[PDB]
PDB file of C-alpha atoms in Angstrom:
ATOM      1  CA  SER A   1     111.723 177.974 185.526  1.00 42.00           C
ATOM      2  CA  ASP A   2     110.560 177.103 181.953  1.00 40.04           C
ATOM      3  CA  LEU A   3     110.304 173.487 183.036  1.00 37.41           C
ATOM      4  CA  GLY A   4     109.313 174.634 186.583  1.00 38.54           C
ATOM      5  CA  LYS A   5     106.176 176.104 185.150  1.00 35.10           C
ATOM      6  CA  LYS A   6     105.490 172.968 183.137  1.00 33.60           C
ATOM      7  CA  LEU A   7     106.091 170.881 186.342  1.00 36.24           C
ATOM      8  CA  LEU A   8     103.628 173.108 188.395  1.00 34.82           C
ATOM      9  CA  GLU A   9     101.024 172.443 185.444  1.00 36.43           C
ATOM     10  CA  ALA A  10     101.608 168.776 185.479  1.00 35.14           C
ATOM     11  CA  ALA A  11     101.168 168.515 189.263  1.00 33.68           C
ATOM     12  CA  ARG A  12      98.028 170.580 189.209  1.00 36.26           C
ATOM     13  CA  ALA A  13      96.575 168.367 186.339  1.00 34.58           C
ATOM     14  CA  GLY A  14      97.664 164.964 187.893  1.00 32.98           C
ATOM     15  CA  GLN A  15      99.896 164.282 184.735  1.00 33.27           C
ATOM     16  CA  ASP A  16     101.986 161.415 186.345  1.00 35.04           C
ATOM     17  CA  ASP A  17     104.066 160.853 183.140  1.00 36.99           C
ATOM     18  CA  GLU A  18     104.744 164.352 182.409  1.00 36.09           C
ATOM     19  CA  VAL A  19     105.982 164.734 185.905  1.00 35.87           C
ATOM     20  CA  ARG A  20     108.401 161.673 185.414  1.00 41.34           C
ATOM     21  CA  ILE A  21     109.678 163.202 182.152  1.00 43.76           C
ATOM     22  CA  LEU A  22     110.314 166.592 183.743  1.00 47.17           C
ATOM     23  CA  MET A  23     112.126 165.172 186.598  1.00 48.31           C
ATOM     24  CA  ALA A  24     114.328 163.112 184.043  1.00 46.21           C
ATOM     25  CA  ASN A  25     115.197 166.488 182.370  1.00 46.96           C
ATOM     26  CA  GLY A  26     116.162 168.305 185.638  1.00 46.48           C
ATOM     27  CA  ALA A  27     112.966 170.443 186.375  1.00 46.81           C
ATOM     28  CA  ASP A  28     113.217 172.587 189.488  1.00 48.94           C
ATOM     29  CA  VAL A  29     111.226 170.173 191.903  1.00 48.62           C
ATOM     30  CA  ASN A  30     110.521 173.237 194.307  1.00 47.97           C
ATOM     31  CA  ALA A  31     109.311 175.671 191.695  1.00 50.15           C
ATOM     32  CA  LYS A  32     106.852 178.133 193.090  1.00 49.98           C
ATOM     33  CA  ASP A  33     103.716 179.514 191.349  1.00 52.29           C
ATOM     34  CA  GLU A  34     102.218 183.056 191.768  1.00 54.59           C
ATOM     35  CA  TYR A  35     100.242 181.829 194.712  1.00 51.93           C
ATOM     36  CA  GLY A  36     103.552 180.789 196.475  1.00 52.48           C
ATOM     37  CA  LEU A  37     102.970 177.033 196.258  1.00 50.64           C
ATOM     38  CA  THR A  38     105.123 174.085 195.130  1.00 50.78           C
ATOM     39  CA  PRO A  39     104.451 170.940 193.132  1.00 51.39           C
ATOM     40  CA  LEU A  40     104.398 168.844 196.424  1.00 55.68           C
ATOM     41  CA  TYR A  41     101.766 170.909 197.821  1.00 54.65           C
ATOM     42  CA  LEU A  42      99.705 170.983 194.676  1.00 56.72           C
ATOM     43  CA  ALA A  43      99.944 167.272 194.122  1.00 56.19           C
ATOM     44  CA  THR A  44      99.100 166.623 197.934  1.00 57.19           C
ATOM     45  CA  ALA A  45      96.049 169.023 197.562  1.00 59.94           C
ATOM     46  CA  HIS A  46      94.842 166.849 194.812  1.00 58.89           C
ATOM     47  CA  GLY A  47      95.625 163.473 196.322  1.00 58.18           C
ATOM     48  CA  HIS A  48      97.916 162.480 193.506  1.00 59.11           C
ATOM     49  CA  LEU A  49     100.066 159.755 195.393  1.00 61.45           C
ATOM     50  CA  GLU A  50     102.171 158.823 192.459  1.00 66.82           C
ATOM     51  CA  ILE A  51     103.162 162.298 191.853  1.00 69.60           C
ATOM     52  CA  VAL A  52     103.924 162.946 195.491  1.00 69.95           C
ATOM     53  CA  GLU A  53     106.114 159.854 195.566  1.00 66.98           C
ATOM     54  CA  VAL A  54     108.081 160.896 192.374  1.00 68.38           C
ATOM     55  CA  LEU A  55     108.517 164.601 193.677  1.00 67.28           C
ATOM     56  CA  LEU A  56     109.832 163.407 197.012  1.00 67.02           C
ATOM     57  CA  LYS A  57     112.248 160.905 195.493  1.00 65.45           C
ATOM     58  CA  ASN A  58     113.634 163.884 193.504  1.00 65.54           C
ATOM     59  CA  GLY A  59     114.168 166.065 196.601  1.00 65.11           C
ATOM     60  CA  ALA A  60     110.949 168.016 196.951  1.00 66.82           C
ATOM     61  CA  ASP A  61     110.849 170.267 200.030  1.00 64.26           C
ATOM     62  CA  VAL A  62     108.559 168.786 202.803  1.00 62.79           C
ATOM     63  CA  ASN A  63     108.743 171.962 204.792  1.00 64.04           C
ATOM     64  CA  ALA A  64     107.198 174.308 202.152  1.00 61.79           C
ATOM     65  CA  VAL A  65     104.274 176.155 203.540  1.00 61.48           C
ATOM     66  CA  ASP A  66     101.302 177.878 202.264  1.00 61.45           C
ATOM     67  CA  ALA A  67      99.815 181.321 203.466  1.00 60.73           C
ATOM     68  CA  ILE A  68      98.307 179.608 206.573  1.00 60.86           C
ATOM     69  CA  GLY A  69     101.517 177.724 207.374  1.00 60.70           C
ATOM     70  CA  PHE A  70     100.192 174.514 206.164  1.00 64.87           C
ATOM     71  CA  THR A  71     102.968 172.046 205.157  1.00 63.80           C
ATOM     72  CA  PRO A  72     102.003 169.040 202.753  1.00 66.51           C
ATOM     73  CA  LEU A  73     101.613 166.984 205.863  1.00 67.79           C
ATOM     74  CA  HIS A  74      99.005 169.538 207.195  1.00 66.13           C
ATOM     75  CA  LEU A  75      97.334 169.234 203.930  1.00 66.82           C
ATOM     76  CA  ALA A  76      97.300 165.572 203.840  1.00 64.97           C
ATOM     77  CA  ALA A  77      96.028 165.622 207.442  1.00 65.85           C
ATOM     78  CA  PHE A  78      93.148 167.953 206.362  1.00 65.42           C
ATOM     79  CA  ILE A  79      92.074 165.992 203.314  1.00 64.06           C
ATOM     80  CA  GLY A  80      92.555 162.676 205.124  1.00 64.00           C
ATOM     81  CA  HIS A  81      95.087 160.948 202.486  1.00 63.91           C
ATOM     82  CA  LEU A  82      96.613 158.172 204.399  1.00 63.92           C
ATOM     83  CA  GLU A  83      99.005 156.892 201.788  1.00 66.25           C
ATOM     84  CA  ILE A  84     100.289 160.552 201.141  1.00 63.16           C
ATOM     85  CA  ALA A  85     100.849 161.161 204.994  1.00 64.10           C
ATOM     86  CA  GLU A  86     102.767 158.034 205.179  1.00 63.34           C
ATOM     87  CA  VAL A  87     105.087 158.726 202.318  1.00 63.76           C
ATOM     88  CA  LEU A  88     105.601 162.354 203.521  1.00 64.77           C
ATOM     89  CA  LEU A  89     106.596 160.958 206.954  1.00 67.96           C
ATOM     90  CA  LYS A  90     109.099 158.644 205.216  1.00 68.06           C
ATOM     91  CA  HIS A  91     110.797 161.559 203.647  1.00 65.78           C
ATOM     92  CA  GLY A  92     111.196 163.518 206.888  1.00 67.06           C
ATOM     93  CA  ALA A  93     107.947 165.607 207.132  1.00 67.19           C
ATOM     94  CA  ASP A  94     107.977 167.191 210.606  1.00 68.21           C
ATOM     95  CA  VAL A  95     105.155 165.958 212.926  1.00 66.20           C
ATOM     96  CA  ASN A  96     105.802 168.821 215.252  1.00 67.79           C
ATOM     97  CA  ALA A  97     105.509 171.730 212.306  1.00 66.06           C
ATOM     98  CA  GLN A  98     102.950 174.106 213.599  1.00 69.29           C
ATOM     99  CA  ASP A  99     100.695 176.304 211.303  1.00 70.25           C
ATOM    100  CA  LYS A 100     100.071 179.970 211.856  1.00 68.60           C
ATOM    101  CA  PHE A 101      97.756 179.201 214.644  1.00 70.25           C
ATOM    102  CA  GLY A 102      99.861 176.626 216.370  1.00 71.79           C
ATOM    103  CA  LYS A 103      98.288 173.540 214.993  1.00 70.09           C
ATOM    104  CA  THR A 104     100.206 170.380 214.093  1.00 67.27           C
ATOM    105  CA  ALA A 105      99.169 167.916 211.582  1.00 67.76           C
ATOM    106  CA  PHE A 106      97.734 165.841 214.296  1.00 69.33           C
ATOM    107  CA  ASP A 107      95.582 168.640 215.409  1.00 73.44           C
ATOM    108  CA  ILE A 108      94.378 169.191 212.089  1.00 73.79           C
ATOM    109  CA  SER A 109      93.526 165.429 211.439  1.00 73.55           C
ATOM    110  CA  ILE A 110      91.528 165.308 214.735  1.00 74.83           C
ATOM    111  CA  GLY A 111      89.748 168.691 213.878  1.00 75.86           C
ATOM    112  CA  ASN A 112      88.620 167.287 210.526  1.00 74.47           C
ATOM    113  CA  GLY A 113      87.491 163.967 211.843  1.00 76.64           C
ATOM    114  CA  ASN A 114      90.352 161.957 209.945  1.00 75.88           C
ATOM    115  CA  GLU A 115      90.715 159.183 212.744  1.00 78.00           C
ATOM    116  CA  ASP A 116      92.891 156.810 210.873  1.00 75.50           C
ATOM    117  CA  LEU A 117      95.271 159.699 209.891  1.00 76.91           C
ATOM    118  CA  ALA A 118      95.323 160.823 213.444  1.00 78.55           C
ATOM    119  CA  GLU A 119      96.322 157.279 214.591  1.00 77.51           C
ATOM    120  CA  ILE A 120      99.417 157.061 212.161  1.00 74.22           C
ATOM    121  CA  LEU A 121     100.372 160.711 213.315  1.00 73.41           C
ATOM    122  CA  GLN A 122     100.031 159.793 217.151  1.00 73.25           C
ATOM    123  CA  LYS A 123     102.336 156.811 216.487  1.00 69.44           C
ATOM    124  CA  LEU A 124     105.157 159.191 215.616  1.00 71.88           C
TER     125      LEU A 124
END
């Protein structure tokens, strides 16, 4: 909560080393900000691969959703971040998870012309 706020801030700002320190001190990996978002979502939104990997290793929730029902996998599909998608899948991101309008991460990747990301999703 105190450390959760600091963790949300470090994820937003791409502060890799601050994230590692906060993990080492037991910060809430799934802290939520006033927008209802978690460090994993925020780091994914920014393309911060190292921070994503660290959060996942410390138990970050892959099923956390935003206001439209986007999981971090949906967001990675939208932005086209191949490596972040791959690590989310390795940690159990649900390839069948549907947003508010019934779209899977695959659907999102195709809608946003991210062909390479669509391929890794189709494979699973």
